């Protein structure tokens, strides 16, 4: 292990959540850069977030230069740790930047290891955003939090779009482009994002069901994926209809305003 | 093999099945050698041929062949770039 002894002493306590040892270690030590690594290639912050420890994650976030913050956010969103998500969103790195909204694949030059995982690639697909991942996992609290910050799933372009961006993404890694479209639609078709996304979500779900059925007929390779998403939308609509227990609510769902 | 066949031929066949159930395991398949998808494909074919040959433990060998096929398909499923799909679909 290339790591030295002091940073190992730091990381063991950070992983196992011993608040005072980590606090004493990172307070005024000349060495012990917080961006150090571990046996599995992980980080102090990622080991702290992997096993829910709001205190350790907060005291690590106090440090100005901390690496792999976006990976920690995606790991917290993957789980139900809403407090850790709030803490990481309160970080000044997210506040004054566009990093939260746009995907890790196309956010910036990406020289910084903002969303990086161990060494080679991101934890999840490079197309998945924090909000798309929250919709995938169906975390209602996290979806609402990310929607408050203005992070919304961008509806993918039409299949036959010929804009310069879609053509450029089609030239290289057309498979990855199709996979990213499917991820965006699986995020949009999530009951969490459907309910918390917009006013009148039953009409949104019906229209998205129709759109996904048409794209299932068009693609014909990922037909089963799009049909599953269309069934998700149909089930959401039927579930919203089922909860009605007055005639006024039934009338409101059966015909709009 | 002849000596092991003379006494306890049943135990010999059982030991062969145990060795193949160890080889066809996703753990040993992944951690055993470089390029494990080709290893799993070849082992799937070998286990299918031995299922046709034995005919007493046909179901055991068919289960192991299905294990190998499932491992190959699972490794293929995880691809999320076109380069990885191309690498799995054709070797080096
Ligand atoms: Zn376009
Ligand atoms: Zn022999």
The CA distance from A187 to A102, in Å, is: 14
CB of B80 less than 8 A from some CB of A: yes
Q: Is B81 within 8 Å of A174 when comparing Cβ atoms?
A: no
Q: Residue A171 C-alpha to ligand 1 middle, in angstroms?
A: 13
End-to-end Cα, chain A, rounded Å: 66
Reported resolution in A? 3.2
Per the DSSP assignment, residues forming a β-bridge with A116 are A122
Residue B85: closest CA among chain A residues belongs to which residue? A175
Q: Which residues in chain A have their CB less than 8 angstroms from residue B80's CB?
A: 125-126, 176, 179
The CA distance from A196 to A140, in Å, is: 8
Which run of H or E residues covers position A58?
helix A54-61
Per DSSP, chain B holds a count of helices (H) and strands (E) of 6, 0
For A154, residues 6+ apart whose C-beta sits below 8 A from its C-beta are A184
How many beta carbons lie within 10 A of that of residue A155, not counting itself? Answer: 11
Q: Which residues in chain B have their CB less than 8 angstroms from residue A179's CB?
A: 80
- In chain A, DSSP assigns E strands to none
Q: Residue A184 C-alpha to ligand 1 middle, in angstroms?
A: 14
Per DSSP, chain A holds a count of helices (H) and strands (E) of 15, 0
For A114, residues 6+ apart whose C-beta sits below 8 A from its C-beta are A68, A69, A70, A99, A104, A107
The CA distances from residue B82 to A49, A104, B88, B89, in Å, are 31, 18, 10, 10
In this complex, how many residue pairs, one in chain A and one in chain B, have their CB atoms less than 8 Å apart?
14
Q: Which of B77, B80, B87 to mutate to test the interface with A (most CBs of A within 10 A)?
A: B80
CB of A175 less than 8 A from some CB of B: yes
Q: Which residues in chain B have their CB less than 8 angstroms from residue A172's CB?
A: 82
Structure tokens belonging to residue B3:
């000596």
Per the DSSP assignment, residues forming a β-bridge with A122 are A116
Residue A176: closest CA among chain B residues belongs to which residue? B81
CB of B34 less than 8 A from some CB of A: no
Q: Which residues in chain B have their CB less than 8 angstroms from residue A175's CB?
A: 81-82, 85
Structure tokens belonging to residue A150:
């203005």
Burial of residue A140 (number of CB atoms within 10 Å: 0-12, 13-18, 19+): middle
Structure tokens belonging to residue B62:
């068919």
Q: Which of A174, A175, A178, A221 to mutate to test the interface with B (most CBs of B within 10 A)?
A: A175
Q: Residue A227 C-alpha to ligand 1 middle, in angstroms?
A: 23
Query: Residue B82 is nearest to which of A125, A126, A175, comparing CB atoms?
Result: A175
The CA distance from A148 to A131, in Å, is: 11
CB of A173 less than 8 A from some CB of B: yes
CB of A174 less than 8 A from some CB of B: yes
User: Whose CA is closest to A191, among A179, A208, A210?
Assistant: A208
Q: How was this structure determined?
A: cryo-EM
In contact, A130 and A74? CB cutoff 8 Å: yes
Structure tokens belonging to residue B11:
């135990």
Which run of H or E residues covers position A134?
helix A130-137
Asked whether residue A52 is marked as a ligand-binding residue, the answer is yes
């Amino acid at each position: 292990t290339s790591l030295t002894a002091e940073e190992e002493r730091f990381l063991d306590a950070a992983e196992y959540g011993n608040i005072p040892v980590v606090r004493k270690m990172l307070e005024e030590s000349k060495t012990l850069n917080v961006n150090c690594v571990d046996y599995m290639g992980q980080n102090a912050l990622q080991l702290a977030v992997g096993n829910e420890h709001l205190e350790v994650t907060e005291l690590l976030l106090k440090k100005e230069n901390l690496a792999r913050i976006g990976d920690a956010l995606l790991l917290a969103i993957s789980k139900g740790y809403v407090r850790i998500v709030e803490a990481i969103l309160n970080h000044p790195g997210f506040a004054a930047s566009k990093r939260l909204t746009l995907s890790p694949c196309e956010q910036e030059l990406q020289d910084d290891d903002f969303y990086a995982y161990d060494e080679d690639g991101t934890r999840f697909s490079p197309d998945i955003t924090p909000i798309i991942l929250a919709a995938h996992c169906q975390k209602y609290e996290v979806v609402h939090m990310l929607l408050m910050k203005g992070a919304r799933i961008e509806r993918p372009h039409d299949y036959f779009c010929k804009c310069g961006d879609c053509m450029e993404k089609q030239r290289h890694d057309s498979f990855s482009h199709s996979r990213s479209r499917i991820n965006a639609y699986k995020g949009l078709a999530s009951p969490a994002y459907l309910s918390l996304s917009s006013e009148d979500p039953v009409l949104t779900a019906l229209e998205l069901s129709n759109e996904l059925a048409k794209l299932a007929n068009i693609e014909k390779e990922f037909k089963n994926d799009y049909r599953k998403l269309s069934m998700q939308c149909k089930d959401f609509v039927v579930g919203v209809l089922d909860l009605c227990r007055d005639s006024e609510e039934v009338e409101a769902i059966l015909n709009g305003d």
